[PDB]
Ligand binder design. Structure first.
Ligand SMILES: CO[C@H]([C@H](C)/C=C/N(C)CO)[C@@H](C)C(=O)CC[C@H](C)[C@H](C[C@@H]1OC(=O)C[C@@H](O[C@H](N)O)C[C@H](C)C[C@H](O)[C@H](C)[C@@H](OC)c2coc(n2)-c2coc(n2)-c2coc(n2)/C=C/C[C@H](OC)[C@H]1C)OC
Ligand SMILES: Nc1ncnc2c1ncn2[C@@H]1O[C@H](COP(=O)(O)OP(=O)(O)OP(=O)(O)O)[C@@H](O)[C@H]1O
Ligand SMILES: [Ca+2]
Length: 359
């Protein structure tokens, strides 16, 4: 009867049981066809399968394939009967109301859960840091958000979204390396470049200075052993790739960078709470894992913020799993149990009960 927590991401599903300290199931958010394969099944049968991604920039957009992902989660990964477990699902900031209603309809009508809830991902990450007030930078495979939160609740009018995250950074590195004369095209090759990104990339504190260092010495060069044993060496690509988060123009996007969106979000909030936001900037998601990113954010926010405001960037080491962990905590609390949408409540009112019980 333990509650389930399923954190639905653009790139990865993280799922498990409330009270656990990490998700037991982490698998790609992919459905593959030459009947259909889900997750690891679809990844380790490379090439001959075309892939669909049911979650696009954080939002569920292919509902039938999303049902396959949920089926795979319950039955293949966790080995549970959904009808025996309250289930907490996560959603993106600013998820449409009709989307949350559809998630609810599916959980009750398709999976026959006894109870469910939908929580905002960035909010859960803040909780996982021990806070109810702060501003989260959540950046994953598909989307980046800035979400200011006060006394446990997101401030929707101040949320910012950037459709630039980990997959765009992998694609950019792939482009750079393809131009330098390497062959990286297939989905197996995408996996290699993702790995190079994750192992060798970092955020420069000062991008101009770092470009000058790389132009004058070999001290920033790092090597990477490909799957056949041949070696690739990169230098300034290491920091040019994630610099895109700060300078989206690198991939031809007109948007403000993540430091500017963070500041703009704080400036949309009541002046009386900004001190608390500046002192509680929490990073969440895999794309915040780059070495150097917290220090860079600290500098850039300091440049924009009023003088002497204490700026604090919190970068939890567990931040690849922060959203999930926040859900695990929330769903375990005694005070939360009154908050579940029960099947009875859903029968009484319908799927639109979700607006009165969730955000
Ligand atoms: C009830 O919800 C309301 C409101 C109605 C809902 C609003 N929305 C959803 C809005 O969108 C909301 C305002 C609110 O109260 C949310 C509260 C937050 C979930 C959260 C609650 C507190 O919860 C907390 O403050 C969370 C923090 O605990 C501590 N005690 O500070 C987490 C840590 C700092 C880090 C981890 O220990 C670390 C990451 C790691 O440690 C080994 C770890 C990984 O998994 C976990 N820990 C884990 C999984 O389950 C648990 N931990 C768990 C299960 O229950 C507990 N912990 C209980 C902890 C006691 C805490 O008090 C100190 C707990 C009350 O506070 C930030
Ligand atoms: N060490 C790392 N350095 C840089 N990027 C990383 C690292 N580890 C993981 N990533 C990237 O994090 C992304 C996955 O993060 P996460 O699980 O938070 O995203 P998601 O929830 O699937 O997506 P979204 O939140 O955008 O919908 C991938 O793009 C992955 O390459
Ligand atoms: Ca996510």
């Amino acid at each position: 009867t333990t509650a389930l927590v399923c954190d639905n991401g653009s790139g990865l599903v993280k799922a498990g049981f409330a009270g656990d300290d990490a998700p037991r199931a982490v698998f790609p958010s992919i459905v593959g066809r030459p009947d259909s394969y889900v997750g690891d099944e679809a990844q380790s049968k490379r090439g001959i399968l075309t892939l669909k991604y049911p979650i696009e920039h954080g939002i569920i957009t292919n509902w039938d394939d999303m049902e396959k992902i949920w089926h795979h989660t319950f039955y293949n990964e966790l080995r549970v009967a959904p009808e025996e477990h309250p289930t907490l699902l996560t959603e993106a900031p600013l998820n449409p109301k009709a989307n949350r209603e559809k998630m609810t309809q599916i959980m009750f009508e398709t999976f026959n859960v006894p109870a469910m809830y939908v929580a905002i991902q960035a909010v859960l990450s803040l909780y996982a840091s021990g806070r109810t007030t702060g501003i989260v930078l959540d950046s994953g495979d598909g989307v980046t958000h800035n979400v200011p939160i006060y006394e446990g609740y997101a401030l929707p009018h101040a949320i910012m979204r950037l459709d630039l995250a980990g997959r765009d950074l992998t694609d950019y590195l792939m482009k750079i390396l393809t131009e330098r004369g390497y062959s990286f095209v297939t989905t197996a090759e995408r996996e290699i470049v993702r790995d190079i990104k994750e192992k060798l990339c970092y955020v420069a504190l000062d991008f101009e200075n770092e470009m000058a260092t790389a132009a004058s010495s070999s001290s920033l060069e790092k090597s990477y052993e490909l799957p056949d044993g041949q070696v690739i060496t990169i230098g300034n690509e290491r920091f040019r790739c994630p610099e895109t988060l700060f300078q989206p123009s690198f991939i031809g996007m007109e948007s403000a960078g993540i430091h500017e969106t963070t500041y703009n979000s704080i400036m949309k909030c009541d002046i009386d709470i900004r001190k608390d936001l500046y002192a509680n900037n929490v990073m969440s998601g895999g794309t915040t894992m780059y070495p150097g990113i917290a220090d860079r954010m600290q500098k850039e926010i300091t440049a924009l913020a009023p003088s002497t405001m204490k700026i604090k960037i919190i970068a939890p080491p567990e931040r690849k799993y922060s959203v999930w962990i926040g859900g695990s905590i929330l769903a375990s609390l005694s005070t939360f149990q009154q908050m579940w949408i029960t099947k009875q409540e859903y029968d009484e009112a319908g799927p639109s009960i979700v607006h009165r019980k969730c955000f």
